[PDB]
């Protein structure tokens, strides 16, 4: 049997039809019982009439049993149209890039149209994962009457209610209209220092963030986390977006268009192969779009139930019932000090891997107040005073009476570098530090020292906590640090809060 798969692309990309055909030339028995005859095509522009004529001509002439559509423009309408076309032709269509890749909410039940994208639910899940990883449990929720906001709010509430994490969702704000006129300032003014999940459009997120800056809601301690809806086109960045604006989006940096087309062809080929193993043969394509054929037209066998169980070469590209990827290639990007969207974390097989173990402070604007109440604190593990343990297996976050602390653990002795694992630190000195934070009103970034051990002057160079403090790598050294003559000469000590001389222990 022969499986004809059509690949429609745009002139914006530099890929040629010969390259698209060559993409399906790996020659390692890609299709065990069938071969795939890829037919490529490039279209100047996407619009209802010409798009429909292109797809119908492909189905009539090439007799394609599938389609892989990659759009260049950002027209969110195109996806809908594709779905419609699928429901009228039973052609399994794959949305790869551009407008066809924007996840549509509710597809037709009879339409076989799957998209390479992440729904608002998956983006909300990634955002909550960021918040949990950075211990931003207290948060607000600013949404508008933009379509799909109800589903976003409902999913956020459901995930908060069904989690063992604190998730102190302070309030939910829905700016109906007139952001600067009235009835919105009152709601926006009750948001305190916390994480603000914002759901709106880009042209509307601009206004909301401008108003938030006018209300002093864009400080060092305000973290605005947003979906891909407002980040949108990474190339153009409004001046109203504060630096450090965390967003999640489908990665267009690493996931190249050629890889997208290869993955789509692999998905279609694997689904056809599974159908061949399970059912009898490949169903021939519909005769034509036109003519008003008198028939129920529903195929006896379709690929709808075979795209849910798909495993390509190395990746698991399975889809859900609604048409969302089970394992989308989501990336967490931030707007750094250079006003460019810099990729930070990634979302792979239901795990969020973040580059920055500790969140770097980002100056939101040029006139932002300087960071003075945030301190970097060193600490060394001592049995009664500083106990370092792993994260709670149940809640996946640092337990009560315990604070996050990043330990620079090496990959191994072979390499000369390591990664910062966020462990949980407690003990006498940690309780003292918590009380000091409560009373003096300062925030801290606790982190274990990895250079030395309690401090020592070797070659006129201090190591350990004393070395970290003297070399301005930390503001204070909370731990089992003994007051000494030389240390007091080098650093400034507070009052001794526990008497520790030198003493001799012997077996009784």
């Amino acid at each position: 049997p022969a499986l004809n798969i059509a690949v429609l692309l745009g002139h914006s990309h530099d890929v040629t039809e010969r390259e698209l055909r060559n993409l399906w030339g790996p020659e390692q028995a890609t299709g065990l019982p069938l071969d795939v005859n890829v037919v490529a095509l490039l279209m100047n522009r996407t619009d209802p009439k010409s798009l429909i004529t292109h797809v119908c001509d492909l189905m009539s002439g090439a007799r394609i049993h599938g389609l892989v559509f990659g759009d260049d423009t950002d027209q969110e309408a195109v996806a809908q149209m594709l779905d419609f076309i699928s429901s009228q032709t039973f052609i399994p269509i794959l949305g790869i890039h551009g407008g066809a890749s924007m996840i549509m909410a509710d597809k037709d039940p009879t339409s076989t149209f799957f998209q390479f994208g992440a729904s608002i639910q998956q983006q909300a899940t990634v955002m909550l994962k960021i918040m949990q990883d950075y211990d931003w449990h207290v948060f607000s929720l600013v949404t508008t009457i933009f379509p799909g906001y109800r589903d976003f709010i409902s999913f956020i509430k459901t995930t908060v209610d069904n989690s063992f994490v604190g998730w102190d969702m302070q309030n939910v704000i829905t700016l109906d209209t007139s952001f600067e006129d009235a009835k919105t300032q009152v709601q926006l003014k009750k948001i305190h220092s916390s994480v603000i999940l914002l759901y709106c459009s880009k042209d509307e997120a601009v206004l909301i963030l401008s108003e938030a800056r006018s209300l002093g809601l864009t400080g060092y301690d305000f973290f605005w986390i947003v979906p891909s809806l407002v980040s949108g086109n990474t190339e153009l960045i409004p001046k109203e977006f504060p630096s450090g604006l965390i967003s999640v989006s489908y990665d267009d940096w690493d996931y190249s268009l050629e890889a997208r087309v290869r993955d789509g062809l692999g998905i279609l080929t694997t689904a056809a192969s599974s159908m061949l193993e399970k059912f009898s043969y490949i169903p021939e394509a519909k005769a034509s779009c036109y003519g008003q054929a008198e028939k129920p037209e529903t195929p006896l066998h379709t690929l709808h139930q075979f795209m849910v169980n798909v495993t390509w070469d190395g990746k698991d590209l399975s889809f859900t019932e609604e048409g969302y990827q089970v394992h989308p290639r989501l990336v967490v990007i931030v707007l750094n000090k250079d006003r460019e969207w810099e990729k930070v974390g990634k979302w792979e097989n239901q795990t969020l891997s973040l580059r920055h173990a500790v969140w770097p402070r980002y100056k939101s604007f040029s006139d932002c107040e300087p960071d003075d109440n945030h301190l970097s604190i060193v600490t060394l593990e001592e049995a009664p005073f500083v106990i370092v343990e792993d994260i709670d297996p149940l809640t996946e976050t640092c337990v009560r009476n315990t604070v996050p602390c990043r330990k620079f653990v090496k990959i191994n002795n072979s390499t000369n570098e390591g990664m910062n694992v966020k462990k949980c630190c407690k003990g006498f000195c940690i309780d003292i530090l918590k009380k000091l934070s409560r009373t003096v009103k300062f925030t801290y970034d606790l982190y274990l020292v990895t250079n030395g051990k309690h401090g020592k002057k070797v070659n006129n160079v201090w190591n350990g906590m004393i070395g970290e403090v003297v070399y301005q790598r930390a503001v204070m050294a909370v731990g089992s640090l003994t007051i000494n003559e030389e240390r007091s000469e080098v650093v400034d000590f507070s009052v001794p809060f526990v008497e520790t001389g030198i003493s001799v222990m012997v077996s009784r």
Binding site: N162, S163, L394
Partner: protein, 48 residues
């Protein structure tokens, strides 16, 4: 099991097991048993 809020392995959903789950799921209308009164259980069901 008497009842304890545990995470089900799919979707990380809180769920009550034992008598607590039996009562909250409608399978039972009353729990006459040594059911200790505590804050965690009292948020979902109400004790006499």
């Amino acid at each position: 099991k008497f009842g304890t809020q545990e995470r089900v392995n799919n979707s990380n959903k809180k769920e009550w097991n034992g008598m607590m789950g039996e009562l909250l799921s409608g399978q039972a209308d009353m729990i006459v048993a040594p059911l200790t009164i505590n804050n965690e259980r009292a948020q979902y069901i109400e004790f006499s």
